[PDB]
Design a protein around this ligand. Sequence first.
Ligand code: 3PE
Ligand code: 3PE
Ligand code: 3PE
Ligand code: 3PE
Ligand code: IHP
Ligand code: IHP
Ligand code: Y01
Ligand code: Y01
Ligand code: 1T9
Ligand code: 1T9
Ligand code: CLR
Ligand code: CLR
Ligand code: PLM
Ligand code: PLM
Lengths: 604, 605
Amino acid sequence: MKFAEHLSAHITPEWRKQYIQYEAFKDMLYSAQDQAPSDTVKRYFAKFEEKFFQTCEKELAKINTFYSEKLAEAQRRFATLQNELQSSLDAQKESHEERVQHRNIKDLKLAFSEFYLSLILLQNYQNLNFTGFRKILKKHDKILETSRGADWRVAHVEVAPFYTCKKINQLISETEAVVTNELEDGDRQKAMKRLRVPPLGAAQPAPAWTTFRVGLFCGIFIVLNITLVLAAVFKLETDRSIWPLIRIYRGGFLLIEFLFLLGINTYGWRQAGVNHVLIFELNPRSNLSHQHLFEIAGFLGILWCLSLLACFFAPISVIPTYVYPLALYGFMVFFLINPTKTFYYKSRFWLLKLLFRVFTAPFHKVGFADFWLADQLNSLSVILMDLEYMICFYSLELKWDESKGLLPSGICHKYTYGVRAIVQCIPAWLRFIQCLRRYRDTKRAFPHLVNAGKYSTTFFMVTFAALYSTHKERGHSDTMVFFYLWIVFYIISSCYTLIWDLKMDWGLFDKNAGENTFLREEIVYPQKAYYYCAIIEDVILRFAWTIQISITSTLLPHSGDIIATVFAPLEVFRRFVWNFFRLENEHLNNCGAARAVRDISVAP
Amino acid sequence: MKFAEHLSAHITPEWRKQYIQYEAFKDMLYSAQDQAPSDTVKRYFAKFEEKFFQTCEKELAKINTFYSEKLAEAQRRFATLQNELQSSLDAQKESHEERVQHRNIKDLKLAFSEFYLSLILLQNYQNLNFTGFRKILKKHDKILETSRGADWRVAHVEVAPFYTCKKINQLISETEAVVTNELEDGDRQKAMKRLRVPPLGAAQPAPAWTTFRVGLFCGIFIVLNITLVLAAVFKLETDRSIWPLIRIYRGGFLLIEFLFLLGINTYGWRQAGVNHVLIFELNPRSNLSHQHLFEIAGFLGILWCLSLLACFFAPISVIPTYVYPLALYGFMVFFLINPTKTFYYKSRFWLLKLLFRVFTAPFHKVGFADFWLADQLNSLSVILMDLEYMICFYSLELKWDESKGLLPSGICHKYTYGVRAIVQCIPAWLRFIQCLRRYRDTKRAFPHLVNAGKYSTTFFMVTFAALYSTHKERGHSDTMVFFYLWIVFYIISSCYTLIWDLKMDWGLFDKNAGENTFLREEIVYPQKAYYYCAIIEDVILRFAWTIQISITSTTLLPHSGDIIATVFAPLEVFRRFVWNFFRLENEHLNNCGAARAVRDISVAP
Ligand SMILES: CCCCCCCCCCCCCCCCCC(=O)OC[C@H](COP(=O)(O)OCCN)OC(=O)CCCCCCCCCCCCCCCCC
Ligand SMILES: CCCCCCCCCCCCCCCCCC(=O)OC[C@H](COP(=O)(O)OCCN)OC(=O)CCCCCCCCCCCCCCCCC
Ligand SMILES: CCCCCCCCCCCCCCCCCC(=O)OC[C@H](COP(=O)(O)OCCN)OC(=O)CCCCCCCCCCCCCCCCC
Ligand SMILES: CCCCCCCCCCCCCCCCCC(=O)OC[C@H](COP(=O)(O)OCCN)OC(=O)CCCCCCCCCCCCCCCCC
Ligand SMILES: O=P(O)(O)O[C@H]1[C@H](OP(=O)(O)O)[C@@H](OP(=O)(O)O)[C@H](OP(=O)(O)O)[C@@H](OP(=O)(O)O)[C@H]1OP(=O)(O)O
Ligand SMILES: O=P(O)(O)O[C@H]1[C@H](OP(=O)(O)O)[C@@H](OP(=O)(O)O)[C@H](OP(=O)(O)O)[C@@H](OP(=O)(O)O)[C@H]1OP(=O)(O)O
Ligand SMILES: CC(C)CCC[C@@H](C)[C@H]1CC[C@H]2[C@@H]3CC=C4C[C@@H](OC(=O)CCC(=O)O)CC[C@]4(C)[C@H]3CC[C@]12C
Ligand SMILES: CC(C)CCC[C@@H](C)[C@H]1CC[C@H]2[C@@H]3CC=C4C[C@@H](OC(=O)CCC(=O)O)CC[C@]4(C)[C@H]3CC[C@]12C
Ligand SMILES: CCCCCCCCCCCCC/C=C\[C@@H](O)[C@H](COP(=O)(O)O)NC(=O)CCCCCCC
Ligand SMILES: CCCCCCCCCCCCC/C=C\[C@@H](O)[C@H](COP(=O)(O)O)NC(=O)CCCCCCC
Ligand SMILES: CC(C)CCC[C@@H](C)[C@H]1CC[C@H]2[C@@H]3CC=C4C[C@@H](O)CC[C@]4(C)[C@H]3CC[C@]12C
Ligand SMILES: CC(C)CCC[C@@H](C)[C@H]1CC[C@H]2[C@@H]3CC=C4C[C@@H](O)CC[C@]4(C)[C@H]3CC[C@]12C
Ligand SMILES: CCCCCCCCCCCCCCCC(=O)O
Ligand SMILES: CCCCCCCCCCCCCCCC(=O)O
């Protein structure tokens, strides 16, 4: 009985402007209703109804025009796939060929599945637009105490082509018949199981077992944290240090914070209307939810706390303390490379495939998902540097003869060899090479080659930073020279990233901006406070991340160690607030070509 | 798409036998389908269709007959309330009177709300019976590759009165119009808000915030429980005892186990179809779920663990250890008597009202809810005895001069005065007096006066136990005499309760047991293993609860008796839990015979 909310959750976000304006009409009715000349009123509503029915005529015209355009495109795509399949069967029947033709079959199958989803989306369009007309017209007659709404509906909407046409139904039946008599080789149970569209978007809930587990893992994590504070304030001794430890376990804290903050992004994208399932090309009918990410965050959270607490205590006296941390990372590695069909095997298979393509950048094309991860792995380098220290620490600074040799020179945590500089230039190198590939593939030097410059600036800042320090460590006479050259590149990079991420990424500061001062014309998120507040945060922390990478090759005192351990967490909160406005921008480009399905092509 | 599961969740459990048999029909179609005599098959399906369409004719006849009966009752109830309201308005307009007439208005309002719910239930009946006919007939034509199903539907079900009648709609509109023009004094927004029926039964879910909180409270409690074991094995000392402690905190463990096991009952009753909302008379459109009980169990669980862990440790050195336990029970008491409109205020208001009526038994009538609680409070007496010891302990054995005087003679935990006997005969006395009232009100000595006998037997067993233990305590020559008289009453009670609850409560061992040997003719729960297994448990633990009330009279001098009591109080709870299933089920099978899916609300003259 709450249609407003029903339509607000059952609308294709890309076509949000082709759907009847229910709330505006309600405002109109309750406006003319709350305000009246209480002959004066007789002529007053003789003018309000004119406007009301006038607006209704325009809205019905829009739905009929939008409906006609989509049906034409549907007939075209149908003819397109029909020929490809006929040609494919003609080629296979007329005929390395098997493997390519196998994909050819797989390509044709994804094409017909994607086409069916589009026909269902168009059917649900007409169904929810007719329900809105009837429910609002009843509110009009019920508010104006008249019978004109009934007259209007029976003579206009009830005859409207958007509500009278009967070709989408035939097209849907034609496709399912072809998919069953051509691809499935005769099985409607398999064909329908493939072409059937379940509830999608923000109109489908999650299992209560997922909500329960999510909450359970969280509650254990909260208690195992208060314990680590007290135990860290009592059982620990001052005779030994806590830095080799803070160094290895700091990495795990960042990865868990990433998965937790990433689930809060999936939630905001879903409730705002940003179709991240089309931007990242994820199965439209089978995809994970914010709850599944919150669940994996809690699981690895408890695993981390128990390992560190077993290090503060001595649960076992036959087990060397330098095995708890090794088992934790060994476990996390297996949970991601499990060759069994369990624990989100399909979701993990996607991540394992993407990572490979993003670590072989120059040999593969770049899609939003591929480049987006490399920008995610460009804010998760502290994890790579922590892993770096751990490897050398257990190889050069670890006394296995001493069972308690895990927690006690520093060459493993220093860029004495540049290992903490080249490793710091791994994620930037991936994005630099991925950009050049895009340029070669697009033949456009803007923005493919201008952006490849934003990634190079880091190489210089990291290099000069490591050189000035080493020369100064040898007391050479090139200490101030490198120091000045270094600080120069630092400020250059800090601004070549802030501008490109507040202009070429978010897309704010638009010539076409009316009331949203310094903001794009159309903003998806609800409040304008979010955009203005995030702009301040990106600036404040864009000049505090170039310093956290220049202290990887400089801060002799443990003071610099505190700085690094206090910044790695804040950098994560920057990629988190930057994951909102980046995806939103990409969505506002699909809401212009009205693209609610992907464009799947077949192989010749 | 899954109609079978849509029917079995959207069916009024009382009328479950008036609804089309969808699964049987599917079995028939897929049976004749899996078994094809591959002329032979031409005549084979010429005989299968005959049977299939024959069964369809009978089912449609049943739905039309059941539908006709309910509509007649609806017209009568409508005329009944109509006259009462007319008379009520005529009396008020024609006229202590204000407060009785206020109730009179409230009585008329609940009557029209309950009537509306009945009309909606009857509308949903016709709607789900026509959907089943169409969905099965399509499966028949789709399985037999014929068009007979379509012909059958258009010429029979499409014309059937259960699908053609249009009077329920008029009745529903008539009632809402009367409730708005008579009671609300003109406001359809208030009238509809009162007479509107939301999703009810096993077809409505719970908020994910409830599932999350439930899980969160559980996780903290589990960790706080592993911490009590390790702390109880390290920080604790042997110089002092742990019995005054086990005595006070044992009571809280039982109450939390009750609320947790009770939520698992609400779950089983809802998924089996036992309408506990009609048996207990709870708002049909606003009632708590198993999740809300699991949530309160976890909350009080953490509160208990933290209090006992603060006693093993010394979180504060200015706070005497004998205040953690006092704050816990003080808090639980407030959470139940909160005068604010928060934390289930409505649900708590019902429990507070029922408890009062069940503690003033002789002055009020007895309903399933009232008598059922007194039987719930008859298995929660260890909590009363623990509360008893604690009070005397903090009054006669507590050294406040010693800040650490909470954990260290025993006269507070002994029946030296009979306090552990009269207190042990409080819940049985309530049930005894409630039964006699029923007899006076029913004038029937069976089963009202035979039942009052099962409750008296306890009075004797506890008494003689004390006589033998107290005479023996003064080494009198009447030690063996009382001991023999005592053991006699013990076995008498152990069997006068097992039989009554195996034949007069559960209702098993029926002349009409058929395939269900030693079980009633119709069993609601899915497996027959549950009934047989529970019978064994009620016996094994019906002869182990009479002993846990005979060790409350200076009998087991050694701490072994203390161990016995602390190990039985938990098992007794698991008996009332397995007895809460078959008792409510029995009451339901009595409503599934008169087809009563709404309560009968009367008005005041
Ligand atoms: C999922 C639900 C929740 C799971 C919870 C898991 C258990 C957590 C238990 C935490 C208990 C800590 C606080 C203990 C309070 C009471 C005891 C106390 O205060 O004394 C400290 C106690 C005894 O000390 P002591 O006798 O000196 O120990 C000798 C060991 N050689 O010290 C002890 O001996 C207590 C040792 C507790 C160790 C708990 C941490 C995990 C232990 C096993 C290793 C698991 C992690 C493995 C990591 C691999 C990588 C993932
Ligand atoms: C190699 C080391 C590099 C250093 C960093 C550590 C490794 C990377 C850590 C982050 C991993 C990626 C997390 C986010 C990726 C997903 C992004 C997204 O929004 O996509 C969601 C989507 C779920 O829907 P999906 O099932 O994929 O739908 C189509 C399926 N065909 O797809 C997904 O959800 C895909 C992701 C699967 C579910 C989450 C996986 C959690 C485990 C990640 C590995 C953690 C351990 C790394 C190694 C040890 C490090 C100490
Ligand atoms: C809801 C989410 C979860 C909530 C968790 C709440 C906190 C739980 C913390 C449990 C910690 C116990 C184990 C501690 C492990 C590390 C320290 C250790 O092993 O040593 C014991 C430690 C120090 O002992 P010590 O220094 O002798 O104390 C002096 C006091 N005069 O001993 C201590 O000093 C530790 C004391 C811990 C006390 C925790 C229990 C609650 C304390 C406040 C009272 C709350 C309950 C109030 C009850 C009222 C009725 C409801
Ligand atoms: C006086 C002391 C005697 C010794 C024992 C302790 C007190 C009694 C403990 C048990 C309390 C009753 C628990 C079960 C009662 C409910 C039974 C049931 O299935 O009914 C469910 C129903 C919920 O639906 P409802 O909202 O009532 O629908 C109509 C509303 N008009 O109605 C309800 O849910 C009603 C119950 C409200 C919700 C649960 C209340 C939990 C708190 C109970 C008190 C606990 C503390 C007692 C005092 C301290 C003891 C240490
Ligand atoms: O009963 P429904 O068919 O579901 O219709 C209801 C109902 O309208 P009707 O009484 O005309 O049926 C509500 O009105 P009241 O019953 O409370 O008088 C109305 O609320 P409004 O009067 O405020 O419009 C509500 O709509 P909503 O909940 O959005 O306010 C609307 O449900 P629909 O929106 O689905 O028509
Ligand atoms: O698509 P629907 O209208 O929701 O109907 C489906 C569908 O039947 P139709 O194809 O005739 O529509 C299923 O059959 P397939 O598509 O898989 O061939 C059928 O399953 P069965 O063939 O096994 O009967 C299923 O019913 P169910 O899920 O109970 O098996 C039934 O949905 P309904 O039960 O709601 O008619
Ligand atoms: C000051 C020195 C050391 C470094 C200079 C690099 C960056 C700090 C700044 C300087 C000028 C900026 C550029 C000025 C103008 C433009 C064009 C502007 O064009 C668009 O809006 C393109 C939109 C589209 O392609 O969709 C995008 C941002 C960009 C490249 C800016 C990106 C960031 C730049 C390169
Ligand atoms: C064993 C000695 C020490 C005590 C005797 C009392 C109980 C142990 C037993 C003896 C005979 C039993 C009765 C034998 C037969 C019946 C009739 C039987 O009839 C019904 O089914 C009544 C149903 C109804 O009234 O609704 C119900 C149980 C009852 C009363 C039994 C209840 C339990 C009784 C009283
Ligand atoms: C490293 C730590 C691991 C912890 C490991 C646990 C991570 C989750 C912590 C709590 C937040 C998620 C669970 C909270 C509530 C969810 O049930 C709802 C479901 O949607 P609904 O409210 O519309 O039914 N989710 C939300 O409301 C949105 C997400 C809430 C985010 C809260 C931000 C703090
Ligand atoms: C004193 C202790 C306090 C603990 C305090 C926590 C008490 C709850 C413990 C766990 C059981 C309840 C929560 C488990 C799952 C629920 O989400 C589902 C919801 O129904 P669904 O599965 O159909 O979606 N409930 C059930 O499946 C039925 C109840 C499960 C009972 C489990 C018995 C152990
Ligand atoms: C200087 C500091 C305080 C700036 C803080 C900026 C943070 C708090 C702002 C910037 C962007 C904001 C987010 C922008 C978008 C959404 C999606 C919306 O559906 C929920 C709120 C949420 C999730 C906002 C949360 C608060 C937010 C993260
Ligand atoms: C001797 C001992 C082992 C006997 C144990 C008896 C117990 C375990 C049996 C007896 C009655 C049984 C219950 C009977 C009814 C239901 C409702 C059903 O929907 C879920 C199972 C459930 C909840 C059963 C659980 C197991 C049960 C509690
Ligand atoms: C750097 C530390 C990060 C962890 C601390 C929390 C950071 C994320 C906070 C998100 C706040 C906004 C959440 C919106 C939720 C909602 O709208 O329901
Ligand atoms: C005496 C201790 C009692 C507590 C231990 C658990 C007792 C209840 C066990 C219930 C088991 C059956 C639960 C059925 C759940 C389901 O069917 O989904």
